[PDB]
Design a binder for this molecule. Structure first.
Ligand code: 8U5
Ligand code: 8U5
Ligand code: NAG
Ligand code: NAG
Ligand code: NAG
Ligand code: NAG
Ligand code: NAG
Ligand code: NAG
Ligand code: CL
Ligand code: CL
Lengths: 531, 532
């Protein structure tokens, strides 16, 4: 009855789950596409064929095939991102958390996980939708999509491996929500898509892509935007990486059909094992198989679409964390360690900026170095460390997002910008890494409300305020309740460019997030590199 | 007797002048070269032919022909720099102040005036050597040299207008000091040359030039260095400007001989009236006729000479002022005024940096703008004004001098670096201009010791400390007195890069003078301009 729901594709049976001394309904692992296996590897998704009988939706689905991190085996801080379910190419499923009793027609939020387009699972403990659905009375969906080569191998001109199919997976799950969420008590006219990292880029990509725009109402982008330098490649570079993937696997490279046929006969892990070898440079914060600017999902360049206003005009809420770059330095740059303060020598600083800006010529490298070096104190290992941290986060996350937010706000219907700079009391990563890429997610999903996780009382308060901002924005297009007595998160406007800090202190309003460095990254350096 | 001196070129009769309730000897207007007039215009100087009888050295000489500033007529702050004597091409004279009684063999200091190589006079009130000669017991010489086209018109390959003749004027006066200062109580083996602005650049050029190195012992450079961007041109650019000067005056341009013959028939003011017209850009802090890198006075490029250590190895003392740029903005850039705080709009800021870096492409201007703009507060007229001020001073004075000091110290025998950041209490210019290009000179020459000039008691002490640093350095190669109990001015070293502030407060040591901006001007921007 409450757990038995008839959808347009067939019947589903959910499960009653406990949450904070109450219960809600969970529908886990609902299929929304045909399994993209066999000759359907690299292909656009096809809708799931209707099934007879009752789909048992009491269990999380498989996770998509992906590179599994083994840098710190058994360490909770890194394992919490790895697939916690069996991996399979049969992975196109979504999960729904529904308040109990079922609401009539309530706001829908659809989570798009991140992971650089190479990793990610809907089933991670930090993406458990039950705290947000219960506390804010929303229908919380989490979708999945093919990652890595399976989702973003791109041989433009081919219909067998066109590229962007992971974005099409997301779109087909949004289409499924549009057609079916009403049967779960959700309003298909009030769907907010939100995501972090590649999920945030994806959200912005659906804002841009005409074929996506009518499948959601408004959007939240966390630490990611569609114009990020890691988030797309040209059709020529996507083809080169695809060909290099076959070369790494002794494939016939004389035609698309032969290359594709060879790659389709490999086991998933054979592709994954060489995935990182197709990158053009030694780099950090670069991923092999990402969306392509193809002339179809994206009709023109992202920059020209942003300039012309050729995107969905709605409300957006978006923001960044204080130390986006630290995790990438830890994993990929010399002198960084999980178990030390990672003071960086000048020689390791210079190596880090070459890894961080891999496309830069020597003059561009000099420019980055000068912009981020204190020449009164150039051997200060802390300043070198934090300088490199800033380089990675500004270039890869903050300044791309600020470019997006400024272009979008020119045509949009309301922008809200945040700067998340709270370091969790119970963080397992060292202090030098600061406020890490991904670590606002646990506040967005209400994990500080779980007494056993040992967050402080004010972190619970911060999580509750963030969930209420996100949900109230989802319901209304404004994170504020306008008749409340609480401090108001102001609109971001072209002129005054206001944002708020998100942390445990009373609200502060600021202006021009990281404006100085983002002039460097968004205006000066591109002009230098194009000279 | 004390005033009657027999030099190698003839007898000279000086005069007894008052100085601070005492007296000393002054020999004013001694000729050291033949008058470079008529067909000797543009030529190298020739030694003054000996004279019979007694040369009357009681009176300042004429000043060389130069552009005269009329922006603020009668205003003391500008008039103090203009010629205070009749202008004439017959201007190659030097002045000497000797302590009384005449010392046996004391330290000599030779002042080389600045003025962008287009202007300047040995006779300005602020260059009066009597206070420094008296207070520090030194023989103080001030030379002169042709400026403008008369000193620096360069048609390389012509022996009639070869270029650099103003530098050769300075050398001829140094040669004269070498040969004759012993007759005035000076030691020709302990001569310190010092100068400000173009005079500081000149001092550096004599350090570089093989033909100058044996005519002095040590050097002081004030707000100028030989590698400054305004201080020299290539032989091609010098020839372009010489031809363009002829074009402005309807001259035959077919040959050097015909062009020079035309230019020698013009009256001095005719050349001066069009002098600024030959600059290749709208700019500030650029001057038309300047030293040329000719392969003769300078055997190779300045940078190669600095890199190879092909220069005189000795002790140097040098430094800069806090606000070198402000004077040039006042006279040449939109939005600046003597009579207001000169808050600068962003539109006038952008025009200013274009005028300040005339040789930069658009990417270069963008780089300058980014380095000096606070994009949290870009419509702040005060920040825009001070940012422009810093750009001008950093690009034209401070960073070129820091490049020189770092290159020199690698081979030299002792570097002392100062940063002069005191604003005179009686300053006549507005507060926004800060510590102006030229305004350390009055402290170097002891004017605060003159009660009628209304400096504070603290400023008199600063001047006496500066005079003592300068003269003690001249005597010994070290500004510090050995077993003194006062705080010590440390050697600038490649590694620690120490310098001192010069102001009324107790001396403080710092390191790496404007290092961040000078990485930009000395390394990044040149690499950007060369690459784009
Ligand atoms: C390319 O550079 C320019 C080109 C132009 C175009 N110029 C013209 O049309 C000619 C008119 C501008 C001529 C300006 C002459 C000013 C010389 C005044 N002498 C001073 C001097 C010094 N300091 C001064 C400080 C103040 Cl506040 C005021 C005057 C000072 C210190 C000196 C250095 C000098 C270069 C000149 C002289 C001695 C204008 C300005 C420029 O900067
Ligand atoms: C060919 O040259 C290259 C060769 C290589 C070689 N690369 C390799 O061998 C593999 C290195 C990739 C290691 C993958 C680690 C997975 C990170 C796990 N996910 C995290 C995630 C987030 N935050 C994390 C924060 C910390 Cl402190 C730790 C992990 C986080 C937030 C997310 C965004 C992500 C991109 C991944 C995931 C979700 C790399 C670069 C090159 O240029
Ligand atoms: C499961 C599997 O490997 N199927 C392959 C398919 O990928 C390929 O395109 C096709 C071409 O004939 O051959 C099949 O055997
Ligand atoms: C559905 O799956 C759950 C989890 O294993 C199980 O407890 C339940 O009995 C299943 N119901 C069926 C198969 O009808
Ligand atoms: C959003 O659009 C509505 C509808 O036209 C308009 O009235 C409102 O002013 C817009 N708000 C913003 C912040 O653009
Ligand atoms: C929280 O703290 C208690 C004691 O303070 C400890 O026993 C418990 O294991 C902690 N919880 C976690 C998840 O570490
Ligand atoms: C030298 O000249 C000055 C002024 O021109 C004059 O007063 C003085 O008498 C002259 N001396 C002699 C000896 O002629
Ligand atoms: C100057 O040279 C002398 C003689 O070689 C040497 O003893 C002295 O250390 C040098 N001083 C500096 C500061 O280089
Ligand atoms: Cl930190
Ligand atoms: Cl707006």
């Amino acid at each position: 009855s409450e757990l038995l729901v008839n959808t347009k594709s067939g019947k589903v049976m959910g499960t009653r789950v406990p949450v904070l001394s109450s219960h809600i309904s969970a529908f886990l692992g609902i299929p929304f596409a045909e399994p993209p296996v066999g000759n359907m590897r690299f292909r656009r998704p096809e809708p799931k064929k209707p099934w007879s009988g009752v789909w048992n939706a009491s269990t999380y689905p498989n996770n998509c095939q992906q590179y599994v991190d083994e840098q710190f085996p058994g360490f909770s801080g890194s394992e919490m991102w790895n697939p916690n379910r069996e991996m399979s190419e049969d992975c196109l499923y979504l999960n729904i958390w529904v308040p109990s009793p079922r609401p009539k027609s309530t706001t829908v939020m659809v989570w798009i996980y991140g992971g650089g387009f190479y990793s990610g699972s809907s089933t991670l403990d930090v993406y458990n939708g039950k705290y947000l659905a219960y506390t804010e009375e929303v229908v919380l969906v989490s979708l999945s999509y093919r990652v890595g080569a399976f989702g973003f191998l791109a041989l433009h001109g081919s219909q067998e491996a066109p590229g962007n199919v992971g974005l099409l997976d997301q779109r087909m799950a949004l289409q499924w929500v549009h057609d079916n969420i009403q049967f779960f008590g959700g309003d298909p006219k009030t769907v907010t898509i939100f995501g972090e990292s590649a999920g945030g880029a994806s959200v912005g990509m659906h804002i841009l892509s005409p074929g996506s725009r009518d499948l959601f109402r408004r959007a939240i982008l966390q630490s990611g935007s569609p114009n990020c330098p890691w988030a797309s490649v040209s059709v020529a570079e996507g083809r080169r990486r695809a060909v290099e993937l076959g070369r790494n696997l002794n494939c016939n490279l004389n035609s698309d059909e032969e290359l594709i046929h060879c790659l389709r006969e490999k086991k998933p892990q054979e592709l994954i094992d060489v995935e990182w070898n197709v990158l053009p440079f030694d780099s950090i914060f670069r991923f092999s198989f990402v969306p392509v600017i193809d002339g179809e999902f994206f009709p023109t360049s992202l920059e020209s679409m942003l300039n012309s206003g050729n995107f969905k005009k709605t409300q957006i809420l978006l923001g960044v964390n204080k130390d986006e770059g630290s995790f990438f330095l830890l994993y990929g740059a010399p002198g960084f360690s999980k178990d030390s303060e990672s003071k960086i020598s000048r020689e390791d600083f210079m190596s880090g900026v070459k890894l961080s800006v891999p496309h830069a010529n020597d003059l561009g490298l000099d420019a980055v170095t000068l912009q981020y070096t204190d020449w009164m104190d150039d051997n200060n290992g802390i300043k070198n460390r934090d300088g490199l941290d800033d380089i990675v986060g500004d270039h890869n996350v903050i300044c791309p997002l600020m470019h997006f937010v400024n272009k979008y706000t020119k045509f949009g219907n309301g922008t809200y910008l945040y700067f998340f700079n709270h370091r969790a009391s119970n963080l397992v990563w060292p202090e030098w890494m600061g406020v890490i890429h991904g670590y606002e997610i646990e506040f967005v999903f209400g994990l500080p409300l779980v007494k056993e996780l040992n967050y402080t009382a004010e972190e619970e308060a911060l999580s509750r305020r963030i969930m209420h901002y996100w949900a109230t924005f989802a319901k209304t297009g404004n994170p504020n309740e306008p008749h409340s007595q609480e401090s108001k998160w102001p609109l971001f406007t072209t002129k005054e460019q206001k944002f708020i800090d998100l942390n445990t202190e009373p609200m502060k309003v600021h202006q021009r997030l990281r404006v100085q460095m983002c002039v460097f990254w968004n205006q000066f350096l591109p002009k230098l590199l194009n000279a």
